[PDB]
Amino acid sequence: ALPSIQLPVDYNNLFNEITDFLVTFKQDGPKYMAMLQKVANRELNSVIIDLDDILQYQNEKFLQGTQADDLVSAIQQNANHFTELFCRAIDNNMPLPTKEIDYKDDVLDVILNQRRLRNERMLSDRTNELFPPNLTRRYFLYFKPLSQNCARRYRKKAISSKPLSVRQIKGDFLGQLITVRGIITRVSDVKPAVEVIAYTCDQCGYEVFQEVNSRTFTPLSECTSEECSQNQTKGQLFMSTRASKFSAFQECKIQELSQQVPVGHIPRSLNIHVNGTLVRSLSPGDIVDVTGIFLPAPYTGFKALKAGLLTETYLEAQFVRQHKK
Amino acid sequence: LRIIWGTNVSIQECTTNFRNFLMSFKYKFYYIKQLNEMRELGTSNLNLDARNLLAYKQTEDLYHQLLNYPQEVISIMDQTIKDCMVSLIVDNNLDYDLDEIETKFYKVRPYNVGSCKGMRELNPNDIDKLINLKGLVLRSTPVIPDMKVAFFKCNVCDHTMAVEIDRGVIQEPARCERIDCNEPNSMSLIHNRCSFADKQVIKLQETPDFVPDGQTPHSISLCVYDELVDSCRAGDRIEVTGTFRSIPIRANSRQRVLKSLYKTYVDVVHVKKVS
Amino acid sequence: LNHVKKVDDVTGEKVREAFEQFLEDFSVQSTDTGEVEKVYRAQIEFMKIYDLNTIYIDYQHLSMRENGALAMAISEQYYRFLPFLQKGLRRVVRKYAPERVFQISFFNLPTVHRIRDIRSEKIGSLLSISGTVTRTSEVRPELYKASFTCDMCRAIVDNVEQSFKYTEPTFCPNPSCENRAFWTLNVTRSRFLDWQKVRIQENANEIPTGSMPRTLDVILRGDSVERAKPGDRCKFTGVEIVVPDKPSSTLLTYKISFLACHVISIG
Ligand SMILES: [Zn+2]
Numbered sequence A: 001a002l003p004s005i006q007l008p009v010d011y012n013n014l015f016n017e018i019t020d021f022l023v024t025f026k027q028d029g030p031k032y033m034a035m036l037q038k039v040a041n042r043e044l045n046s047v048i049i050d051l052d053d054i055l056q057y058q059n060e061k062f063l064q065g066t067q068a069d070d071l072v073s074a075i076q077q078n079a080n081h082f083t084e085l086f087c088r089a090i091d092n093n094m095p096l097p098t099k100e101i102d103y104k105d106d107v108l109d110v111i112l113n114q115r116r117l118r119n120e121r122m123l124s125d126r127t128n129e130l131f132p133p134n135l136t137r138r139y140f141l142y143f144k145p146l147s148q149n150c151a152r153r154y155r156k157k158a159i160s161s162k163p164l165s166v167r168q169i170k171g172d173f174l175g176q177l178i179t180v181r182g183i184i185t186r187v188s189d190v191k192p193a194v195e196v197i198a199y200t201c202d203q204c205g206y207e208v209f210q211e212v213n214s215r216t217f218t219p220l221s222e223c224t225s226e227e228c229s230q231n232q233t234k235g236q237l238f239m240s241t242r243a244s245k246f247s248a249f250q251e252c253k254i255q256e257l258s259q260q261v262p263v264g265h266i267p268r269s270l271n272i273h274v275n276g277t278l279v280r281s282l283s284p285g286d287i288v289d290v291t292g293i294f295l296p297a298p299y300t301g302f303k304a305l306k307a308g309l310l311t312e313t314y315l316e317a318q319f320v321r322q323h324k325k
Numbered sequence B: 001l002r003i004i005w006g007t008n009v010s011i012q013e014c015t016t017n018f019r020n021f022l023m024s025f026k027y028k029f030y031y032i033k034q035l036n037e038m039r040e041l042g043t044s045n046l047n048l049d050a051r052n053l054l055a056y057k058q059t060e061d062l063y064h065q066l067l068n069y070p071q072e073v074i075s076i077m078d079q080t081i082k083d084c085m086v087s088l089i090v091d092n093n094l095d096y097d098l099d100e101i102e103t104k105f106y107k108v109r110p111y112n113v114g115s116c117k118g119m120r121e122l123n124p125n126d127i128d129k130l131i132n133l134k135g136l137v138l139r140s141t142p143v144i145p146d147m148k149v150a151f152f153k154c155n156v157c158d159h160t161m162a163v164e165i166d167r168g169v170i171q172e173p174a175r176c177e178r179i180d181c182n183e184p185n186s187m188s189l190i191h192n193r194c195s196f197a198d199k200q201v202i203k204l205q206e207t208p209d210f211v212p213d214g215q216t217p218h219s220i221s222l223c224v225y226d227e228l229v230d231s232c233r234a235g236d237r238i239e240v241t242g243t244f245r246s247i248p249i250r251a252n253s254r255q256r257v258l259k260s261l262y263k264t265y266v267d268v269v270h271v272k273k274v275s
Numbered sequence C: 001l002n003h004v005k006k007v008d009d010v011t012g013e014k015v016r017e018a019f020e021q022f023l024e025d026f027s028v029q030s031t032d033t034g035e036v037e038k039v040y041r042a043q044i045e046f047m048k049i050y051d052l053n054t055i056y057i058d059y060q061h062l063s064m065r066e067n068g069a070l071a072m073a074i075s076e077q078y079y080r081f082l083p084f085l086q087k088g089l090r091r092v093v094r095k096y097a098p099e100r101v102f103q104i105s106f107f108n109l110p111t112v113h114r115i116r117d118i119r120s121e122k123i124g125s126l127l128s129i130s131g132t133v134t135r136t137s138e139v140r141p142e143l144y145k146a147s148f149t150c151d152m153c154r155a156i157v158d159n160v161e162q163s164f165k166y167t168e169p170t171f172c173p174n175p176s177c178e179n180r181a182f183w184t185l186n187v188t189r190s191r192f193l194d195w196q197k198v199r200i201q202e203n204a205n206e207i208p209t210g211s212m213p214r215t216l217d218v219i220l221r222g223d224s225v226e227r228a229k230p231g232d233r234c235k236f237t238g239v240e241i242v243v244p245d246k247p248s249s250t251l252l253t254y255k256i257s258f259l260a261c262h263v264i265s266i267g
Helices: A011-021 A031-040 A051-060 A072-078 A089-093 A109-126 B014-019 B032-041 B060-068 B070-089 C011-024 C040-050 C059-066 C069-073 C078-096
Strands: A046-050 A140-144 A178-185 A198-201 A237-239 A248-255 A270-275 A287-292 A319-322 B137-140 B144-147 B196-199 B202-205 B219-222 B244-247 B263-266 C054-058 C103-107 C131-134 C196-201 C216-220 C233-236 C258-260
Touching: A011 A089, A031 A046, A046 A051, A051 A072, A051 A140, A140 A319, B014 B060, B014 B070, B032 B070, B060 B070, C011 C040, C011 C059, C011 C069, C011 C078, C040 C054, C040 C078, C054 C059, C059 C069, C059 C103, C078 C103, C131 C233
Parallel strands: A046 A140, B219 B263, C054 C103, C216 C258
Antiparallel strands: A178 A248, A178 A287, A198 A237, A248 A270, A287 A319, B137 B202, B144 B196, B202 B219, B244 B263, C131 C196, C196 C216
């Protein structure tokens, strides 16, 4: 029943290596303290993680010991998993106060602030399992490609970051960061996406947070809360839009530059999803090296036709470098 | 102080802060004159001004409470202007014969809060906010009726009791009314008897004079409500104010599942006006 | 199982008696040379000749009795009174006369309102609507009242089913089928009537082009069926209702579909 086979790569101590990568740093105080605190200070959202510095760190951690497991290959090998792993570590080292944060000030921060206030109060009163770490962010982690002038270290084959043809794209690049290039096509207009969307109950309240996973989710009613549940009888609950965390979403297709097309065939477009800060960065008719994790988003059905599963994919945008500023 | 959820705009606080807002020129940098004009005609729909609360003190914060949280602030503002009508009448003693004129429904129509840049610029982070928009109207949809107070029936006995909609949902009691009677059998919902309220829909191109050039402009469907319905025709390039809304849509088909990408439309509490 | 009992109709009975007494009593203004006696008893008696099972009474006459206070119950709350106005009227006919389908059509409303002036407050209420007809359609039967049963298997229940769904019969049965089961469709016991849909459009002289005039559905139920013509303005009896085509009903998408139980070529 669903066999298991070990792999040399382990995320446990790699997380540890991420933690040692963050807030302990020299070469550029350190950059990850200031770059993080400026986000904590809420003048900044996008966290641009360069793979270049991850490359710089291993040198200090190898030769120059003590030797450790590799990231730069292990990241781009997966690169989806690190967004949920490499980025959560930031939560553990982040400055708490941090400075002059207040409440309002910001819209919707007061909501959650009062959530945790009433939750703390009511829990500390009841005792006389917590809001998910993804709801409280207000920042986005973006990796960038290593071209690179310093990639000549050399780790050689380590680079993708290979400004490849759309034709060069294979089903063996899915789940691996790949730069691509071409003209922007159709550049669909921005619409809000969704992440948690904690619906509100009625009688006894509380909250529940439904994870937004893949493309879509099924909405639930019943009651999750034990208080409204069974007595009496099932409390009614509705989604509150103010409470939800919205991440900008913009999709756009990119046809090949047509010089990269052989004597035959046809220009082939590739669908690209955008999130957070990188939104609106893209404009129609513009050649751009777009880098991102290359992923499928199945299937929404259909599901009879394929069979299977015939993923059809898309490219998650991560970084954006346009030709001709 | 009566904290209200996450909007945290306090009842029995801002009501008084608005109540002493009365009688001001002042400032400026009308107000009671235009209201005194309003009381005779019975036209209701107080258009306000915006900006008033800014820079004026008190209620420098109320402007920010409305701008950041217009949903509640408009309801509270309507309650307060109603009770300030009630307090206007007692000043002149017996008025208009007598108490019925106060019972009639009133509302505030805020407009021109800051200058917003386009639809296009808008962040997904602000979904309850007052948002200026401008563009021509490609079409005015036929009127769709909207639930206000719901009616219900059963095979037994039959009984006529009914319940209001409140929030955007309808829950009828399984069993039952009056009495009792019971039995478990499903409720019979009369379609025609229940009350309705006018909801139009208005398509709006985003500022055809302001465009990426050559990309064709993006549609913004603003749904209006009440009096505002059928108050316009087409192609009006002027401006509109109202609260932004993102609501889930049902997808494929059936299935009772959410597409997980919420569509966005404007509540458009106020409109105005010409060229 | 005894049903105890029924409730309460209150005002509906008051309107039943008022309307009955109104259709009975004059209802006469003119004296000497009339226009006197009755006219509505004489209306039903004149109706006994062709027996086309419809009546015509003026709204203006109906407003005169109570000074319009009677006409108000029959105005905004009107659809509440449809089953009462019919059976009540029959309680009259049974007295004065010896296979019953009765279509009541009021007319001559004090003010004509355009399709643009149509509001959600006007629902369940008589409103006169003027405008040109577009896209008439072929006459087909309405289920009206049906016997659909059995329904497991001998029941033969004939009742109700008047509302437009048409689902379903056989619910709260027989006594006692306990269906469920088949519906089951029986069309020989079910009387039918009328009808033809017309899509009414505002006249072109009023509409300020650029306009793009907004059409709306009016279905003709009643003997006024076929009286309508394409390319011409007509005045109707309001009964605005709504038809399914927003919240949900949990343990709905609606639009204005105007009804007319009377037609005239005026305009
Ligand atoms: Zn609850």
